[PDB]
């Protein structure tokens, strides 16, 4: 209860155990303050170094480049409940060590009593379901296209059409926050007018994740406006906003916090470097975000299905025993009726946000038919019937399977 | 004046020009909003892919893995003066593209009129010189060791000794911000008592970079305390604080903002991925930081001397014509008398912060002798005389060269 643990994959032509203790020392005090190495397991060595290293080559250190999984134990008293310094401690300068040709933070384990000193999701799954009025199926979302460039009026008109098509959730693209084309203030006011009127007429709430990413003081002003205009959700580019900004924003907004992880590829595409999702999502969940992106099965991005599955499962796993702090996973990229089965089987529940672009909007019979094809796919998998069997009963679905 | 430019190195088994336009489209609107590809130059292909990619392997796309340097042009109207969304635009999801097995943002070029809409350094070089009263030589700094674990009283006693040894600048390690061992409030009060008394007696100001890294609201409280206690500088772990937090902090503190870049190795160690320093430091300078770290020549970290030299030169280069917004480069890692010549030759001036740990503290004749050895090295290079010649006149320097 007085420590946390961090697991790494390291690579070095030197002795892995010595290097692990260099890591432990450098990230702490070099009894109350020294981190320790709890586990070392040597893996198959690499024939070539994963990363350049000037210190090692200055000395012509010979291969092979040994690999090991290690666990470090850190005294909590070194950090207290300081989120960005927690990151400086478990990640920080470790990546730069002259001893290593690879270092990746794989996972974190925090005591519940420590986790409690940060922020919990205000809404998470249950709150998002309450706000979208969606009970026993996933929430279906889409993204405003073009990503940026529409006027506020054009965005509002489009949002109206997307609502009428039957989605539960709509988000700004991450490159659209406060563009001159459709400044945040004008965009929120115009869009919410349509969303409110749509709710009135249809009885269906639609959650719009307005991208309020900005300077922190500005973000708070944006979030206040979204709330005043009857919104339920704000989106932020977490990596560029930072833990410091997001934790502060979390304390002052009662809205759903939809975390967009753009930039995470820089932190993770190289398996020998950076941060695996388990660790990444642990740190981000301490800021109190309600949703996290996991990309998608059979997606158009670089991520493997295995990574997407594990990342989704991370979202549903409480950070510590009895915390009840799961977040809603958002699947995206090439999602459509044909990725529903794999998605359902990955999550093992319907507690997910399913983002579909062309899978809805490019349906041959229109966006409404597109939404229906996705809803029909979900009905099928929840009932346990294969999609191509259910399609015999369901024209929108059948047409989608044939077209895509 | 209505655009900015971003240069990348990309790797793909597909057509580089097509991929470049995919990048341009995805990061904009897929006349007023569409980014364009201004330059493509194909380089030598790679025999193996730099990064795994599930989309490409799902399709058994054959090699080779082509490489190209590209330049994108982005319309400013898409972004306006929004720092974290600027990052989402020029970096963001580009790293995840299914088309690529490598993507690195190399550099950025912004118009002066756009740069002006962000934050300038409050102090930069001139202000730091004024606050340390150091005019015609570099400022010499050291780091409080152990990194974390000392009590507030122990830290203050140590800081007193470091002042007496003759340094100009002292910083907390990045893993020490608000530890239970020496909470920020107690540490600032105890340390500044010693620093103020040292100034009184010696006539020498010493700048202490207190690590205030924390939740944004807390950071502002910490910065207010540092100012009230007569401090001149606060340090922040920029990557974990985020652009949103730092830009806001910049507007409310009149202190020197010492940016610690821990975590940047994750963003840069793999040459096929992430962000080169030119681009990184451009984005960070828009938040108004006063100092940036460049690591060190002959250092103990992984970075090459070439990278350190270029990064230092970046710091001194104004972001745009006539901006006069240079920041102070901080050199560190294995720095001592013997790295002074290379450092001077890299910077081509004395406008730098020279951080020395063991190079000062482990001098055989004591820390004061250590500081003197470094000051003597600087005197030598500024006068144009080789260190081993000057050492014949200068015992502290001679002893350092023999010992280290």
């Amino acid at each position: 209860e007085d420590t946390l643990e961090a697991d790494y994959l390291i690579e070095t032509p030197l002795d892995p155990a010595r290097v692990a203790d260099v890591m432990a020392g450098e990230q702490s005090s070099g009894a109350r303050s020294r981190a320790s190495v709890l586990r070392i397991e040597e893996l198959e060595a690499a024939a070539r170094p994963s990363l350049p290293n000037a210190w090692l080559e200055r000395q012509g250190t010979p291969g092979p480049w040994r690999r090991a999984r290690i666990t470090l134990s850190f005294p909590l008293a070194n950090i207290d409940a300081n989120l960005p310094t927690l990151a400086a401690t478990v990640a920080g300068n470790l990546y730069d060590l002259g001893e290593v040709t690879g270092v990746r933070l794989l996972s974190l384990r925090l005591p519940a009593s420590y986790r409690a000193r940060f922020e919990l999701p205000r809404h998470g799954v249950a709150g998002t379901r309450a706000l979208t009025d969606v009970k026993d199926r996933p929430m279906i979302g889409t993204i405003i296209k073009p990503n940026v460039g529409l006027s506020a009026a054009e965005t509002a008109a489009l949002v109206r059409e997307l609502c009428e098509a039957g989605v539960d959730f709509i988000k700004d693209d991450e490159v659209c926050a406060n563009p001159a084309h459709a400044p945040l203030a004008e965009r929120v006011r115009a869009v919410m007018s349509e969303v409110r009127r749509y709710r009135e007429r249809s009885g269906r709430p639609v959650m719009v994740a307005f991208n309020i990413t900005d300077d922190l003081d500005a973000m708070r002003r944006h979030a206040e406006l979204v709330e005043r205009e009857g919104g339920s959700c704000v989106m932020a580019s977490i990596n560029w906003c930072g833990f410091s900004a997001i934790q502060s924003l979390r304390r002052t907004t009662p809205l759903v916090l939809h975390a967009h992880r753009n930039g995470y590829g820089m932190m993770s595409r190289d398996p020998a470097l950076g941060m695996s999702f388990q660790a990444y999502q642990t740190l981000w969940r301490l800021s109190g975000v309600d949703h996290m992106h996991v990309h998608g099965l059979a997606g158009k991005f670089a991520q493997s299905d295995a990574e997407v599955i594990e990342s989704a499962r991370d979202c549903a796993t409480p950070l510590a025993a009895g915390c009840d702090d799961a977040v809603l996973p958002a699947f995206s990229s090439g999602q459509w009726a044909g990725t529903v089965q794999a998605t359902f089987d990955a999550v093992r529940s319907t507690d997910l946000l399913f983002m579909s672009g062309g899978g809805i909007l490019a349906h041959p019979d229109g966006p409404a038919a597109g939404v229906t094809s996705v809803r029909q796919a979900w009905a099928a998998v929840q009932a346990g019937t294969p999609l191509p069997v259910y399609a015999e009963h369901m024209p929108e679905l059948r047409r989608a399977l044939a077209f895509f």
Side-chain angles (χ1 to χ4, degrees), chain A:
Chain A
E1 259 162 335
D2 297 319
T3 66
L4 62 81
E5 295 178 4
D7 291 351
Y8 303 82
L9 164 70
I10 66 167
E11 182 189 296
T12 178
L14 312 179
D15 180 69
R18 184 206 138 212
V19 177
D21 193 65
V22 165
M23 299 174 61
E26 287 299 295
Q27 298 311 107
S28 64
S29 57
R32 67 187 175 203
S33 68
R34 178 58 148 78
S36 59
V37 181
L38 293 185
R39 293 191 273 283
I40 300 165
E41 180 186 8
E42 181 144 4
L43 308 173
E44 186 179 12
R48 53 168 187 81
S50 297
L51 304 171
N53 181 321
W55 188 82
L56 286 171
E57 50 195 356
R58 262 200 289 279
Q59 293 166 332
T61 313
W65 289 266
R66 305 167 67 176
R67 290 167 64 252
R69 188 181 176 110
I70 68 172
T71 296
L72 302 186
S73 180
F74 284 96
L76 298 182
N78 286 5
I79 316 173
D80 259 351
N82 189 303
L83 185 47
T85 301
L86 171 56
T89 300
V90 299
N93 271 1
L94 287 176
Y95 300 108
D96 297 302
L97 295 176
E99 289 87 354
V100 305
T101 54
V103 172
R104 185 178 175 109
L105 172 61
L106 308 175
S107 59
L108 293 167
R109 288 177 295 282
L110 277 57
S113 58
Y114 186 59
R115 193 270 174 273
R117 298 164 65 190
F118 299 84
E119 291 291 329
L120 295 167
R122 196 179 287 265
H123 295 289
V125 176
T128 308
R129 289 194 172 286
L131 286 161
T132 57
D133 196 30
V134 180
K135 296 312 175 177
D136 291 305
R137 58 171 179 86
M139 291 139 285
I140 310 305
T142 197
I143 306 81
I144 292 165
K145 294 282 181 178
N147 297 336
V148 65
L150 297 179
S151 70
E154 288 170 332
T155 303
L158 171 55
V159 164
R160 178 52 147 157
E161 298 166 1
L162 300 175
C163 288
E164 297 283 354
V167 300
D168 306 296
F169 176 99
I170 298 166
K171 64 184 288 302
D172 287 323
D173 190 78
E174 76 279 359
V175 307
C176 183
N178 193 25
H181 307 123
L184 189 284
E186 299 178 29
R187 192 170 81 256
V188 170
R189 296 182 167 101
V191 169
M192 285 311 305
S193 182
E194 292 286 355
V195 175
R196 292 188 306 260
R197 184 187 156 181
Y198 174 76
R199 191 221 333 118
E200 289 172 19
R201 298 178 58 82
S202 77
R204 304 185 68 251
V206 177
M207 174 174 294
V208 177
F210 292 104
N211 185 10
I212 64 169
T213 302
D214 211 330
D215 160 85
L216 181 280
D217 292 339
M219 284 205 292
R220 278 176 161 156
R221 292 189 298 271
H222 301 333
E224 292 180 29
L225 174 66
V226 172
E227 180 177 0
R228 281 197 303 275
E229 292 289 325
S232 60
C233 181
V234 292
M235 159 183 165
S237 294
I238 49 170
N239 296 315
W240 315 125
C241 289
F243 298 115
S244 297
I246 298 302
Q247 183 173 0
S248 288
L249 173 64
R250 164 81 290 174
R251 285 198 307 277
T252 55
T253 185
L255 306 171
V256 176
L257 236 187
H258 181 86
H260 197 280
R261 76 185 202 183
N262 70 92
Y264 175 65
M266 162 174 66
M267 306 172 54
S268 65
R269 290 266 325 249
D270 180 340
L273 187 62
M275 202 178 302
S276 302
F277 188 82
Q278 199 290 332
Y280 181 74
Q281 66 100 43
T282 296
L283 296 171
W284 278 106
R285 280 166 66 177
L286 300 175
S287 72
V289 299
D290 291 300
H291 305 170
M292 286 287 284
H293 277 257
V294 301
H295 290 185
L297 299 177
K300 300 180 181 188
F301 288 130
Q303 285 75 31
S304 67
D305 283 355
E307 176 169 350
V308 174
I309 294 169
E310 179 177 344
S311 297
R313 292 178 175 170
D314 285 333
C315 291
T317 304
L319 293 188
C323 285
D324 187 38
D325 60 2
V327 297
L328 187 70
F331 291 83
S332 71
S333 187
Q335 299 306 294
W336 68 290
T339 61
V340 166
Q341 185 71 250
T343 297
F344 187 49
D345 291 342
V347 174
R348 302 292 173 78
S349 85
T350 61
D351 290 342
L352 63 100
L353 174 59
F354 193 74
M355 306 295 307
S356 182
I360 279 168
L361 302 187
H363 191 288
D365 301 318
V371 174
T372 296
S373 75
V374 168
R375 289 285 295 277
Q376 284 169 349
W378 282 108
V381 309
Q382 293 177 230
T385 184
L387 263 61
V389 173
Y390 201 59
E392 291 299 298
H393 301 305
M394 298 285 158
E396 288 87 352
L397 177 58
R398 192 170 63 248
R399 291 286 297 265
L401 294 172
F403 180 84
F404 297 107

